[PDB]
Design a protein around this ligand. Structure first.
Ligand SMILES: NC(=O)c1ccc[n+]([C@@H]2O[C@H](COP(=O)([O-])OP(=O)(O)OC[C@H]3O[C@@H](n4cnc5c(N)ncnc54)[C@H](O)[C@@H]3O)[C@@H](O)[C@H]2O)c1
Ligand SMILES: NC(=O)c1ccc[n+]([C@@H]2O[C@H](COP(=O)([O-])OP(=O)(O)OC[C@H]3O[C@@H](n4cnc5c(N)ncnc54)[C@H](O)[C@@H]3O)[C@@H](O)[C@H]2O)c1
Ligand SMILES: NC(=O)c1ccc[n+]([C@@H]2O[C@H](COP(=O)([O-])OP(=O)(O)OC[C@H]3O[C@@H](n4cnc5c(N)ncnc54)[C@H](O)[C@@H]3O)[C@@H](O)[C@H]2O)c1
Ligand SMILES: NC(=O)c1ccc[n+]([C@@H]2O[C@H](COP(=O)([O-])OP(=O)(O)OC[C@H]3O[C@@H](n4cnc5c(N)ncnc54)[C@H](O)[C@@H]3O)[C@@H](O)[C@H]2O)c1
Ligand SMILES: Oc1cc(CCc2ccccc2)ccc1Oc1ccc(Cl)cc1Cl
Ligand SMILES: Oc1cc(CCc2ccccc2)ccc1Oc1ccc(Cl)cc1Cl
Ligand SMILES: Oc1cc(CCc2ccccc2)ccc1Oc1ccc(Cl)cc1Cl
Ligand SMILES: Oc1cc(CCc2ccccc2)ccc1Oc1ccc(Cl)cc1Cl
Lengths: 286, 283, 286, 283
């Protein structure tokens, strides 16, 4: 009986869903953490049957969704909730959605878990290049995309079993430049990859828990489209990557499933590339 | 059905055996390519049942073939080795010949493990290594991967997968990892990228390398017991303090060889309890 | 006539001073940016002759200090000055010390400059390991140590000549784990090294200006001592680095001087290690 | 006074010449080691004054010596090359002999440049490279650095400095950089670390490598005009859009060889207008 918390699903078109689907093949029970502004729309669509085909694994298997909870990675505890958000129409009907509140809820309802997925990012100035990003904009990217991972580990470690495992998602813009990946998103991914190492040291030594990050190639997710640098990145990857196949969210999903299992017990602190090999190339091969 | 060729098993104390065990768990059929210096004894020990405890999960060894990755084709075999005591009776042990042999008996296969290394002057530091010694390390430990690819690629299906084993001394200095071995592993990790480009584009085949932590194998023990220090250091300082097992590398190998890793290629994946991530002893 | 702005000197015991000294050999005119809480003590010591021996370059040369200005890397513009700090006894007697204010002052007094040094870091929670660092603590480290570099470039680019050059200082904890380098300092250095690349792209393409970072080995600076992980790091480096010599601030200084000159015109976006080789080692060589 | 040996100049269109020019600016005395296939023509062109325009900053060429980094000692020279048309008249061109020669004429020196590479099968992709071709690339382009170190180290002062040149195809795939050249540069960058450990500890000598961007040298032009594409791509996409000059590498070389870089060792330093930092064309 394995339980995974996946923080960062808003629809069926991102990596978090692909990860949920692949874990389900292994009979892992899934809890979704859903950003409060899209929580109700998600629930409506789910209730309305919009995701029913998206949920099919096998001839014999539906995805087993244990729960779906509102989850906001910008707040650590109840003390951090600011009053404008406390009053926002979308947040008003929701409760216990800070990082600590959701660990407590999960623990109270289901007991201890053994897999944790961070699958989320935000950067209010993602559309500006780094040089024109404000302090507020930069720190928001770091806060939502990088620090949220450390906070998640801090609060969830207490409700996890020994030999538990943690993954996050990153992008290669942290290491090589991608013009257009703005707003301090590149900086936040670099911090996330570095933090994955430091966290692996503390979590390995103090709890025997492992943490890794998957550097994913491009996927036409809601976040990607909102940034169409994405249609370009996808076309580029499909022309130039060693592997010509379309990169699927379930390609990242099956890697995540492995990293989250005991089959990878001797892997920790690593950035694992799942991108059809594209990261290895220097120049276009024209 | 999955068929894997493992080049580089001589006993049950190395990474090749741990990889065999884990692949057998997943019901993949295993063919061993065994270096002629140890071929007769491995066979004998197996027949005489000494590996019975070691095969307990039981393993499905399809075939056990003499194999010497120094030789690309039968024409490369020098007269001396051809006439040598351990080679004289044996046939079809070159890279081209074992590939041809395997294809003839079993058809196309889908998994290839390179799990071997050799270097005449491993006990000399790099600065004191001869041209002959350095090139011997590159020939046996790096070029052997390229040639294995070249020949096995024609008897492998699309979507097949290749792994080798490497060591972090390619990237950070390990005094004692001598004879051009550090150089050979740096070349192997770089070649893993270039191969991944050619194999992916032309054959839809994947190739990755596992950077393993220390294990007290036959090879490791022979190198003038830095190995027991290496192990002790890893168990004291790695983020993860469990004993590193051969089957720990084996389960990551199984993953990389399987269709679960279809979007991973050209990568060096560290299976080392995280030791590689540390800068300074945390004393 | 070359002018360099060095932001981050508090005394003669850090890297900024070593950099100032080596630039002075090349007859570059130096402006110091000095954190306001230590500005007056610095000035007093300077006036009192405390640094006179520290200032000697040659038999023939004193260091040419063009000006010394209060400079606070936590504030971008006059609008950002918060009222508690506006009232702090040390800030009360000082003005025009935000990043934009000091670029304007330098420009007004001396015209355009051609070298810029970022030599500063802070992290209010540096003493906590990463897992126990708060959001506030983490974002403070990123704000003062990482974002300050982007802000400096944004405001100083307008007062720089073409073919100008920029360096910052980093540490290898960004890339490999150093227990004790807490507070999100590791994360901030990782962001700084990544940002150095992204900035090099924008600054190279839009202004023909270069930017690099020096990854320095350990030096017994005020900041290092305040963290004695430092006495240990220094002893370790001196036993285990390829090069056995004591690492001097002027060893980093002479590298900085080169990176800031036209002799390195084809180098940009790089992390250059100046650490006696220590970064290349895997295990102690006992 | 500073004395530098530059191994790998055959003309004025390569990195070796650009390095010579910049070192001469700093009044270092330059000795050239010139490969015998081009030795007579280089000498002739120099004597006949064709390099007069090229030497304008004027340069201080101390000596010009035939040198073949394939040979560690006189005993390594095969009878065929010893008797060959271009080698037959020449003496003292092995690594040990040029070191001995230099020491005898000039005493100890303080600077060494490795600026050479060679590979029989550079035009073949890696997968199609023979064992002989791959090992030839490693021998000439990587091992030559180790051996140069071994011998020059005894005729170098403490605090001396060594550089080689490398290319980013060691780290990221460049289709067309064939024949084991990518492998050779990965080995050279790794060996630069191991050497830095041994040389630093035992001799207080530094060693670093420069990863240069593209330059239309004789060597580059011979490889079946990817070079003109490489250059055009670099000038369109690098953060810095200036033409990359030979003397741009030369001024970084001068820095690394000088006491200004005394705390830098084991490093691969990119001098490439920043091209290496990019992931995707910014189109
Ligand atoms: N799509 C790609 O091409 C790609 C490539 C590499 C890495 N990634 C990474 O994968 C991860 C998932 O993104 P995706 O592309 O699947 O897009 P997505 O739009 O499916 O998921 C991003 C999720 O983050 C959530 N989120 C935003 N702010 C939040 C907050 N304050 N608190 C809690 N949740 C919040 C959003 O609701 C959204 O569901 C991200 O870390 C992203 O950086 C994506
Ligand atoms: N033991 C470790 O700690 C360790 C760590 C990292 C990497 N590795 C790597 O793992 C791989 C296996 O090493 P091991 O430690 O398990 O040693 P091992 O002694 O168990 O296996 C090496 C095998 O290579 C075979 N071999 C050598 N030359 C051959 C040739 N020319 N043709 C065919 N076979 C040949 C030998 O018979 C031997 O069985 C190597 O690539 C090694 O560098 C080992
Ligand atoms: N000392 C080392 O061992 C070492 C090693 C590697 C990197 N570094 C880096 O070198 C740089 C300089 O540090 P140092 O070791 O010379 O110490 P230092 O104490 O000499 O200098 C740090 C300076 O930063 C200033 N500062 C702090 N907060 C500021 C703010 N909000 N605004 C403006 N200035 C502020 C301080 O006044 C201080 O003068 C830092 O970036 C540090 O991370 C140091
Ligand atoms: N041209 C480029 O774009 C470029 C880019 C990156 C790196 N490099 C590297 O720079 C170095 C110099 O290359 P270049 O492009 O200036 O070419 P080049 O043709 O100017 O110089 C290479 C020299 O090596 C000499 N040489 C070859 N084999 C030798 C041997 N066995 N002994 C003695 N000398 C020998 C040749 O005579 C030749 O002068 C090489 O290490 C090369 O890989 C070149
Ligand atoms: O981290 C990502 C990385 C990519 C890679 C493709 C790409 C898109 C846009 C610009 C450059 C590259 C797509 C989507 C990603 O997720 C993001 C990006 C930005 C933001 Cl604000 C949020 C999220 Cl979830
Ligand atoms: O690549 C290896 C790496 C290690 C771990 C590190 C180590 C052990 C002993 C001395 C130095 C370093 C052990 C065995 C390894 O396999 C080798 C090494 C050298 C040789 Cl000649 C052959 C083999 Cl199979
Ligand atoms: O970035 C640095 C890096 C070191 C390396 C040596 C070291 C000291 C303490 C813990 C670990 C390593 C020393 C000082 C450094 O400067 C710092 C560190 C922390 C802070 Cl809050 C400020 C500054 Cl200027
Ligand atoms: O190492 C080099 C790197 C380049 C730049 C990249 C390049 C040029 C032409 C084809 C492919 C790649 C040019 C020349 C280089 O020197 C070489 C390459 C191969 C050989 Cl056999 C000899 C030399 Cl000197």
């Amino acid at each position: 009986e394995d339980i995974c918390f996946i923080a960062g699903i808003g629809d069926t078109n991102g990596y978090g869903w692909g990860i949920a689907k692949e874990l389900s093949k292994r009979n892992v029970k899934i809890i979704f953490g859903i950003w409060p502004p899209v929580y109700n729309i998600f629930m409506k669509n789910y209730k309305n049957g919009k995701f029913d085909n998206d949920m099919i694994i096998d001839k014999d298997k539906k995805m087993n969704i244990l729960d779906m909870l509102p989850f906001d990675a910008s707040f650590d505890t109840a003390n951090d909730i600011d009053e404008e958000t406390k009053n926002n129409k979308r947040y008003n009907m929701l409760q216990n959605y800070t990082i600590e509140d959701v660990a407590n809820l999960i623990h109270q309802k289901y007991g201890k878990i053994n897999m944790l997925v961070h699958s989320l990012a935000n950067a209010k100035e993602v559309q500006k290049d780094l040089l024109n990003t404000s302090r507020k904009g930069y720190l928001d990217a770091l806060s939502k995309s990088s620090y949220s991972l450390i906070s998640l580990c801090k609060y969830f470690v207490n409700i996890m079993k020994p030999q538990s495992s943690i993954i996050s998602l990153t992008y290669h813009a942290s290491q090589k430049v991608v013009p257009g990946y703005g707003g301090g998103m590149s900086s936040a991914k670099a911090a996330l990859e570095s933090d994955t190492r430091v966290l692996a040291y503390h979590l390995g030594r103090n709890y025997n828990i492992r943490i890794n990050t998957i550097s994913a190639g491009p996927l036409k997710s809601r976040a990607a489209t909102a940034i169409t640098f994405i249609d370009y990145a996808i076309e580029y990857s499909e022309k130039y990557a060693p592997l010509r196949q379309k990169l699927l969210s379930t390609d990242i999903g099956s890697v995540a499933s492995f990293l989250l299992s005991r089959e990878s017990r001797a892997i920790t602190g690593q950035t694992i590339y799942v991108d059809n090999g594209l990261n290895i190339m220097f120049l276009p091969d024209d």
